[PDB]
Design a binder for this molecule. Structure first.
Ligand code: HEM
Ligand code: HEM
Ligand code: CYN
Ligand code: CYN
Lengths: 158, 158
């Protein structure tokens, strides 16, 4: 329990920061790719997943890769993520994220469900095996998912 | 009452279409501009407005132009609108719009509230008085707000 200075308290650093801008560009050639991929994977270990997304709605877990009611979330979330990227240390990062915390905080998205996304995201970054991408991204992206994920709070405000 | 072919049944035409792509570009220099402007206006004639948006939440109708919890909706909705623009005759326009129809259809957004947005949008286009912009945009944009607005249905499905 805390009541803090609420900002994404230190967004890595300029030296670490810069990478997630030029890396995002590379991995977001594939708006339907990297994210729909990042998602079919989360759905394979977790059960709890495929039922809490209204439009994927319990119809067929495993069969995926792409088709109709899923190519929609592939982009929907991805241009809006290029909004979080664009607002990296730009004031409206609090108010932006909070309307999104209003979404997830409803259903029952918490600390369990979050460490599905954030380590399957780590695996997506392996398939772009252009040899050993530096350990500063293996700190940095881990440091981002640690401070940007709904600024940690969702149900954390008593 | 109908059960139709549901698509945005004829998105104007290539001849009319083209304009809303090169016009969108001009008017979406100002992501916080044109939309926050398009919105402060809706709020001046309608009462019903300023209370149904969770983040503008009843605190001060008239004072606006910009500040914190409103510069957030200014962009949020605008990159996602460049998604509808980008998907003009691209299959995922049904599934894209429908998750958005799921949002508005909840509260009580209907045919009344819609002809606030769509004629205040007409007025925004006047302030870009670069002399008399052709009557084909004064058909076309009127023809778009007539077929893209949550593909008309929201509460229209019995
Ligand atoms: C960096 C990670 C994530 C971000 C920033 C993100 C982003 C988004 C976005 C943009 C939306 C739409 C919000 C709106 O309605 O305005 C969304 C929807 C959703 N998210 Fe998160 N998401 C993330 C992680 C997760 C995780 C780990 C869960 C875990 C349960 C999750 C579950 C959902 C659900 C249930 C929806 C509803 C889909 C709908 O009907 O539109 N997301 N997310
Ligand atoms: C071309 C016109 C419009 C479009 C495409 C549009 C788009 C959007 C978008 C992108 C959202 C966020 C949906 C989400 O949660 O994922 C939104 C929210 C909302 N819209 Fe619409 N809008 C339009 C017209 C209107 C009108 C005329 C009303 C009338 C009442 C309205 C009221 C709302 C409300 C109540 C919100 C909730 C804001 C929030 O808490 O995020 N909008 N709209
Ligand atoms: C969010 N998915
Ligand atoms: C929608 N505003």
């Amino acid at each position: 329990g805390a009541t803090q200075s609420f900002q994404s308290v230190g967004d890595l650093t300029p030296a670490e920061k810069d990478l997630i801008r030029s890396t995002w560009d590379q991995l977001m050639t594939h708006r339907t790719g990297f994210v729909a991929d990042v998602f079919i994977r989360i759905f394979h270990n977790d059960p709890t997943a495929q039922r809490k997304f209204p439009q994927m709605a319990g119809l067929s877990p495993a069969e995926l890769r792409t088709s109709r009611q899923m190519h929609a979330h592939a982009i929907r979330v991805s241009a809006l993520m290029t909004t979080y990227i664009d607002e990296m240390d730009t004031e409206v990062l609090p108010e932006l994220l909070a309307t999104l915390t209003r979404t997830h905080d409803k259903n029952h998205v918490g600390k369990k469900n979050y460490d599905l996304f954030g380590k399957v995201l780590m695996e997506a970054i392996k398939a772009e095996l252009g040899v050993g991408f530096t350990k500063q991204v293996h700190d940095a992206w881990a440091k981002t998912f640690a401070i940007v994920q709904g600024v940690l709070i969702t149900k954390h405000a008593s």
